[PDB]
Amino acid sequence: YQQPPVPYRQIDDCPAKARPQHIFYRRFLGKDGRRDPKCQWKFAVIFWGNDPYGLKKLSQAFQFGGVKAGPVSCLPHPGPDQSPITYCVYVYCQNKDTSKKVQMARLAWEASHPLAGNLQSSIVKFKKPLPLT
Amino acid sequence: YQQPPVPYRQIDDCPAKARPQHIFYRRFLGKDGRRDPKCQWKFAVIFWGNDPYGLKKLSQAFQFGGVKAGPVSCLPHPGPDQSPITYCVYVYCQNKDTSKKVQMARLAWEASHPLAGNLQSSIVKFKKPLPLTQ
Ligand SMILES: [Cl-]
Ligand SMILES: [Cl-]
Ligand SMILES: [Cl-]
């Protein structure tokens, strides 16, 4: 079964391929990236595309105190037959504002690097808080 | 990389372990289990627990026209060190009403089978629609 990505206590623990995107995010996010005990995890950003490799680096990059990305997952088949897999990554946050910021953080990264894929995305809102405390 | 659950054209195509739960969901959901082109995929139910095998059965059980579950995924480690894994499964719906019905569909199953694990769940709302059309 799938395992959650290994959390980084420091910068050097992140894989080399996802490191520059990670560094970009740590600086981009700033304070928002830090952990807030007062806020509940009821918000997330869903990223989806056809390339799991790119979503993997996004997943590996988004490992912070206030931003934690789940592993690479996928959406169910849209049709009655198996289709080309649409992969996806849920990037969980503590507040709605951080979710919007993460969404743009990717947009900033995509505009900076044309090699990166044009990921589709959406803000996610949960009714109950998730066990990430 | 992870793969999405297989879609069924008929009940006999559903995996054997998930068949008893699938047939129950097909009846309970009834008309709500069917697909609506007019509706957009902006809603979901996230189930989570410690047992991936139960969630895998749930995942395989929920495969309908208007209700489709993703594979067995998981939530990230809460702390800097590794802790016992919290597995999860998103069940995608077309409306909030159906998502509530799916949520209680499992609760009905849990009430129907005390052997089944007690899965924590929450309704999900997406700002932008998801590509599960046509
Ligand atoms: Cl990329
Ligand atoms: Cl959005
Ligand atoms: Cl809920």
Residue numbers in the entry:
A (entry chain G): 1014 to 1146
B (entry chain H): 1014 to 1147
Recite the paper's sentences.
The KSHV latency-associated nuclear antigen (kLANA) and the MHV68 mLANA (orf73) protein are required for latent viral replication and persistence. We solved the X-ray crystal structure of the C-terminal DNA binding domains (CTD) of kLANA and MHV-68 mLANA. Importantly, kLANA and mLANA CTD dimers undergo higher order oligomerization.
The structure of the kLANA fragment comprising residues 1013–1149 was solved by X-ray crystallography at a resolution of 2.60 Å, where electron density was observed for residues 1014–1147. kLANA(1013–1149) forms dimers that are stabilized by an eight-stranded antiparallel intermolecular β-barrel to which each monomer contributes four β-strands (β1–β4). The total dimer interface area is 2080 Å2 indicating that LANA is an obligate dimer. During our crystallization trials, we obtained three different crystal forms of the kLANA CTD, all of which contained higher order oligomers. The monoclinic and orthorhombic crystals of the kLANA CTD contained pentameric rings of dimers, whereas the cubic crystals contained tetrameric rings of dimers. In all structures the oligomerization interfaces are formed by helices α1 and α3, and the interface comprises an area of approx. 500 Å2. The angles between two neighboring LANA dimers range from 0° for mLANA, 72° for the kLANA pentameric rings to 90° for the kLANA tetrameric ring. Moreover, both pentameric ring structures of kLANA dimers display ring puckering, where the interface between two dimers is oriented out of the ring plane. DNA bending has been proposed to be a prerequisite for the initiation of DNA replication and a LBS1/2 containing probe was previously shown to be bent by ∼110° when both sites were occupied. R1119 forms a positive charge at the bottom of a cleft, which is occupied by anions in the kLANA crystals.
